[PDB]
Amino acid sequence: KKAQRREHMLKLEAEKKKLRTMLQVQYVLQNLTQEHVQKDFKGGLNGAVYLPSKEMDYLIKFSKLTCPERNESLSVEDQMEQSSLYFWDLLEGSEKAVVGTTYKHMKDLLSKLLNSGYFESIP
Amino acid sequence: KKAQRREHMLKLEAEKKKLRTMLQVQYVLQNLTQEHVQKDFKGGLNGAVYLPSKEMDYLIKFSKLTCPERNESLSVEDQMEQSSLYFWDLLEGSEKAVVGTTYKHMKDLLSKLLNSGYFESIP
């Protein structure tokens, strides 16, 4: 019973560190939709880790897919349900096909801009 | 060992249903900062569950506290760390003092606009 309590604290730290990386990834993909960012990554002109347009469009569509606008025919609860599953499959490092890539490479690709420098202190 | 796998599926559904309610609450507090909303709840003029200004300012400051703008002196990773903890203390129904209310009443108050009607199909 003593080791049963040590596992509860570890999961709380895991689900919290997840929630931290969540909002980080949300911040990355929201400002990613800006146009001055995608043109900046054309050759990395202001601290952007260079990325070809194939790898850009991979997640530029994911940003549209993961942080979308509400469908008036869809309840805004089940919209978040769909968006929440996308985020969850991303952290799992799964290999389900999505927009032409894999969820494992998605986390790696987004982790590349989670240490780039464009993700903090940007216009 | 068989019952150990049934618990993993239940936690996955719990952490997913959490992630669903998360983004719902984020959507509630983001559009909450709009001015046409707080003036609408002055007497519920377009489907708004009436709320006095004490109970409004409780969460109108929480929205500023929970979905803020980045501090240039703070790394945008630890900013999300702080915001993630606020969301997590909210779902726990805790009783820590915050902006003059309690986290248990916060979830109840926000659950009142999670079934109101102003939270779907709004300008």
Residue numbers in the entry:
A (entry chain A), B (entry chain A): 196 to 318
Give the published text.
Human Caprin family comprises two members, Caprin-1 and Caprin-2. Previously, we reported Caprin-2 as a new regulator of canonical Wnt signaling through a mechanism of facilitating LRP5/6 phosphorylation.
The structure of hCap2_HR1 could be divided into two subdomains: a "blade"-like N-lobe (aa A112-L205) and a "bow"-like C-lobe (aa K206-P320). The parts of helices α3-2 and α3′ in the C-lobe of chains A and B, respectively, packed together forming a parallel coiled-coil dimer with the rest helices in the N-lobe forming two antiparallel dimers. The dimeric interface has a total buried area of 2414.4 Å2. Close to the junction of the N-lobe and the C-lobe, a cluster of basic residues aligned along the solve-exposed side of the coiled coil of the N-lobe. Surprisingly, we found that Cap2_HR1 binds specifically to phosphatidylinositol 4-phosphate (PI4P), and mutations targeting R200 and R201 in this basic cluster not only disrupt Caprin-2's association with PI4P but also lead to altered cellular localization as well as decreased activities of Caprin-2 in canonical Wnt signaling. WT hCap2_HR1 exhibited a binding affinity with PI4P (KD = 2.0 μm), which is about 70-fold higher than that of the double mutant R200E/R201E (KD = 152 μm).
